[PDB]
Structure 1
Amino acid sequence: AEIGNKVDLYGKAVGLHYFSKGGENSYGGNGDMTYARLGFKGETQINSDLTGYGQWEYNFQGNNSEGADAQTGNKTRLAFAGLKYADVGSFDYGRNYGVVYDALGYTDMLPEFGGDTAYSDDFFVGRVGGVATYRNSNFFGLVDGLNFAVQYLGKNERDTARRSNGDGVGGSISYEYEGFGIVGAYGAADRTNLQEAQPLGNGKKAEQWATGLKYDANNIYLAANYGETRNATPITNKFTNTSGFANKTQDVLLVAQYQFDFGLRPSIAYTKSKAKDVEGIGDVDLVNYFEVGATYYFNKNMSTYVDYIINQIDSDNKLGVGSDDTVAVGIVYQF
């Protein structure tokens, strides 16, 4: 809620419970999942052709005690600033969305779950540190609906292989016309020595790509993503306590939703990602499910939701991917 400069502090409180049998063997786990969010975003008009802007956003976990676990799962999601010039484009630097999320964003619309391939700190698919992003709308004002973006990922040598990266570039192009949108996005980067010493994944570069199609009009939302990755998607073998990256993955995400005037937004979805050439096992499913779910919007400040994952991962999955379903029920106050 808005606190020549327009600055806006924002957030929400999310009362959130997950239901699974036992949740060690499930898609989402079991129990209290309450958290809150806080951030600001602002933009300042510098002149008629130039705006300056910034955004910061934080996750506060609501399901930890006030003892020594208090900080578990607290983190900054976003922290960047930039400049937007005339028809030239925008440029920002900091922690932000990786460019391949320009595609994955199409399916990442579910009430609680979904977007399973947009890992955080995973090269270009999710939120990530140290990125320089250039974005361009309507091709310099010459072509209504043709947007593009390029992004430069600086190396992050962290203590974990999962959270690290090397230098890389990625980019994306999209075209929209009367409710239809089409997008493609691709990136590659160096892997770090720590990533390469892992027993899962083989190679010295990582690539992610995805294409998107979507129809967004007349209270209907339909969307589709297909993508693949090389040496990029993080993976654990829970049976030998083995970690790393899948050599290859192949990914599909489908979503159908409708918006009723009275607030009810039903959701239907399917998601599958399968890893290939995983050392010592071959091909495995990482994600496999159908979704049903709904959100009820009381207004712009208040909603509740149920999200139900009909898990299709079989009880024998070779890496130890859980097989039970998960339901989520949430209540949200936002501003």
Structure 2
Amino acid sequence: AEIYNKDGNKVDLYGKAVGLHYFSKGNGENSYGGNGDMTYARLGFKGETQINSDLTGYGQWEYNFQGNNSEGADAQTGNKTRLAFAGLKYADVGSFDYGRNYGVVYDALGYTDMLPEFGGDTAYSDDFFVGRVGGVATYRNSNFFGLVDGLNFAVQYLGKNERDTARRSNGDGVGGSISYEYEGFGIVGAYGAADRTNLQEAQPLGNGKKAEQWATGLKYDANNIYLAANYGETRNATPITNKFTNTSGFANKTQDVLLVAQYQFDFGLRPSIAYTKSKAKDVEGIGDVDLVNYFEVGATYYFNKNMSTYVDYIINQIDSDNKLGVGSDDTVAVGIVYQF
């Protein structure tokens, strides 16, 4: 919320409170989203200062405080900084920002990441260019140097992150995005590739020296309708775990489809239907195997800009014999949300 705005600087302290519970068969182990209390809270700030007529500097920080956990030895589980970056935006020349921010492939994957709770299964975090990642400089240009209204593109250089775990590490890499939007219609695609750290090459699943991620998106968002389709392919970049050997790694190849349709009624209900399938190939020892395979139904009721309730049912088409052990049973979520 804009809590401060004098002398060219403006501060937005924001956050939400999410009362959230997951319902699933059994304990929730062999299910899509598990079973239990998943209440969480977010706090953050985004500030933006007017240096002069054409220049503007900005920074932003964002945190996930989990509320499902106790006050004992586990009180910090899943607590994390999500965003932390700062940058400048000069008139019609574009914007530059560095820190922990979103990879550019998400400029597409954000078309189908609109479900009341689930969806966007491919916007993995700490996975190169698809989701939030550490140490990215990102150049953005809005309306093409002030000329082509609706024409957007972005260039991003992704720094190395040699972390403890193969799953969160990444080497140097580059990527970019282009988007056109006109009067409700939107089409975009984006691509990025990057080296694999020696730790990543050493895992049993996924072998190659280069990782690649690309995606395209189609969307309609006007009147009260929202339609979206996402397609992408990856090489050596999507993370997997075969729980039968409890072996981790990366999927040599994947094919990802995400489809999303919603409508917004006058009385505030926003129903949601979606399809989401992610198929992997050349996974060592397995061959082909689905990782995400489900139909979604759900709805949100919007009391006003601050308050919302929602239900999210994942009719899960994963089979019990799934060769990677990905959960095969359905899962449904209930949520109550105050945000400011």
User: Is the structural similarity TM-score above 0.5?
Assistant: yes
CA shift digits 1:178-228 (9 cap, x unpaired) = 100110100000000000000000100100000000000011000001000
TM-superposed deviation, 1:14: 0.3
The reply on whether 1:33 has 2:35 as its aligned counterpart is: no
CA shift digits 1:249-268 (9 cap, x unpaired) = 00000000011122110000
Equivalent-residue separation in structure 2 for 1:47 and 1:203 (angstroms): 48
Q: 2:23 corresponds to which residue?
A: 19
Equivalent-residue separation in structure 1 for 2:155 and 2:255 (angstroms): 24
TM-superposed deviation, 1:111: 0.2
TM-superposed deviation, 1:6: 1.1
Structure 1: runs of 5+ lacking an equivalent: none
The reply on whether 1:69 has 2:68 as its aligned counterpart is: no
TM-superposed deviation, 1:282: 0.2
Structure 1 stretches of 4+ moved >4 Å: none
What secondary structure is seen at the aligned counterpart in 1 of 2:230?
Answer: strand
CA shift digits 1:244-292 (9 cap, x unpaired) = 0000000000000011122110000000000100001100000000000
Equivalent-residue separation in structure 2 for 1:87 and 1:259 (angstroms): 35
Number of matched pairs: 335
CA shift digits 1:74-111 (9 cap, x unpaired) = 00000000000010000000000000000000000000
Equivalent-residue separation in structure 2 for 1:42 and 1:239 (angstroms): 47
What secondary structure is seen at the aligned counterpart in 2 of 1:77?
Answer: strand
TM-superposed deviation, 1:137: 1.0
Equivalent-residue separation in structure 2 for 1:86 and 1:261 (angstroms): 38
CA shift digits 1:50-92 (9 cap, x unpaired) = 1111110000010111000000000000000000001000000
TM-superposed deviation, 1:134: 0.3
What secondary structure is seen at the aligned counterpart in 2 of 1:307?
Answer: strand
Equivalent-residue separation in structure 2 for 1:197 and 1:228 (angstroms): 23
Equivalent-residue separation in structure 2 for 1:137 and 1:156 (angstroms): 29
Q: Equivalences for 1:186-201 in 2 at 5 Å?
A: 186-201=191-206
What secondary structure is seen at the aligned counterpart in 2 of 1:103?
Answer: helix
State the superposition RMSD in angstroms: 0.5
Equivalent-residue separation in structure 2 for 1:81 and 1:269 (angstroms): 35
TM-superposed deviation, 1:145: 1.1
TM-superposed deviation, 1:142: 1.5
Q: Percent identity?
A: 100
TM-superposed deviation, 1:31: 0.6
Choose 2-11 or 158-167, whichever is displaced more.
2-11
Q: Equivalences for 1:277-288 in 2 at 5 Å?
A: 277-288=282-293
What secondary structure is seen at the aligned counterpart in 2 of 1:29?
Answer: coil
Equivalent-residue separation in structure 2 for 1:132 and 1:103 (angstroms): 18
TM-superposed deviation, 1:5: 1.1
CA shift digits 1:126-158 (9 cap, x unpaired) = 000000000011110111111000000000000
Equivalent-residue separation in structure 2 for 1:242 and 1:266 (angstroms): 38
| TM-score when normalising by structure 2 | 0.98
What secondary structure is seen at the aligned counterpart in 2 of 1:141?
Answer: helix
TM-superposed deviation, 1:122: 0.1
Equivalent-residue separation in structure 2 for 1:182 and 1:140 (angstroms): 20
Equivalent-residue separation in structure 1 for 2:113 and 2:167 (angstroms): 22
CA shift digits 1:21-53 (9 cap, x unpaired) = 110110000010001000001111111101111
Equivalent-residue separation in structure 2 for 1:176 and 1:146 (angstroms): 7
Structure 2: runs of 5+ lacking an equivalent: none
| TM-score when normalising by structure 1 | 0.99
Q: 2:336 corresponds to which residue?
A: 331
Equivalent-residue separation in structure 1 for 2:146 and 2:85 (angstroms): 25
